[PDB]
Design an enzyme around this catalytic site. Sequence first.
Site, PDB file in Angstrom:
ATOM      1  CG  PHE A 122      42.028  33.511   6.937  1.00  0.00           C
ATOM      2  CD1 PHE A 122      42.770  32.668   7.767  1.00  0.00           C
ATOM      3  CD2 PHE A 122      40.654  33.288   6.821  1.00  0.00           C
ATOM      4  CE1 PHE A 122      42.151  31.646   8.483  1.00  0.00           C
ATOM      5  CE2 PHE A 122      40.032  32.269   7.535  1.00  0.00           C
ATOM      6  CZ  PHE A 122      40.782  31.448   8.368  1.00  0.00           C
ATOM      7  CB  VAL A 128      39.707  45.759   2.358  1.00  0.00           C
ATOM      8  CG1 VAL A 128      39.375  46.738   1.241  1.00  0.00           C
ATOM      9  CG2 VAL A 128      39.218  44.368   1.969  1.00  0.00           C
ATOM     10  CG  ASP A 177      29.922  36.692   2.268  1.00  0.00           C
ATOM     11  OD1 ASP A 177      29.033  36.710   3.149  1.00  0.00           O
ATOM     12  OD2 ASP A 177      31.098  37.041   2.495  1.00  0.00           O
TER      13      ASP A 177
END
Length: 291
Positions: free
Chosen positions: A20, A23, A136
């Site tokens: 989605f 960077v 994460d």
Amino acid sequence: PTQFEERHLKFLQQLGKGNFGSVEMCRYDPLQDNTGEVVAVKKLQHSTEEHLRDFEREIEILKSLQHDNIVKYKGVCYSAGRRNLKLIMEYLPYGSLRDYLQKHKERIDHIKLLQYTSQICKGMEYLGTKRYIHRDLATRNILVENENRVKIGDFGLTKVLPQDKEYYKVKEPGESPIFWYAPESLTESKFSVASDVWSFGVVLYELFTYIEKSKSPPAEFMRMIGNDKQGQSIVTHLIELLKNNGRLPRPDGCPDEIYMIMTECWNNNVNQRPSFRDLALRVDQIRDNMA
Ligand SMILES: CCc1cc(O)ccc1-c1ccc2c(C(=O)Nc3ccc(C)nc3)n[nH]c2c1
């Protein structure tokens, strides 16, 4: 000082991307002479209203964070409106700790691994003061500022605990980094300081394998699950293995006190896992006793 326009951003190279979002390394060049600062820019691909909201939340979390071991927030590009926002973060040329450790493993001894470890603990400690659950924690999402400083990055999954509850339940999870996840995160989708502590255990494991491919958390867990995978999914096999006290093995080289910290972080009971403050104190002291 935080007003970034689209017309001044210049693409240099893609640093990484996902399903989605992406960077990119960009130059913010308002004087258009290529003297402008180099920044890391996040943008989304196919956006739904809740993906847009998640990104708005990440930005809010990033706005409030100022700490030596947390990646610096710079600003947002509002030029295309709410639908197409760009997140401006500091560009760190040494990249992720995962890649950095593989590359410089010959000059990174145990004492240095513990230097990085306690910077992560202090960063995580600061996060806890604001009721932020990272979700994460992994060496791929820790970034390197220099040989003596690491910074916690990728806050894309980060959540805020309710004022009256010690866990946050995620109502719609996509693809998850399940080999870093606590059992209660797998079975109940419940995320807390204690699930971050579990994940930190896996990060500490990562550091002491020196990112050896055959010894990575996915590699060892799949090996431990076995060849008889018939009848159920991988996550289901992982849940049973963790329930039966199956754990990532001690790397042959890892100090026993370090492996102990890992196994304590990997307690099934959320209420029995150590605190990030205690983790910092124990790591600093092992590091002191080494030299
Ligand atoms: C902007 C997305 C984001 C979102 C968030 O919530 C927290 C941090 C970041 C982030 C993520 C990655 C980087 C990087 C880098 O990836 N650096 C590099 C350098 C060199 C090479 C080869 N690869 C890679 N630098 N600053 C970064 C900030």
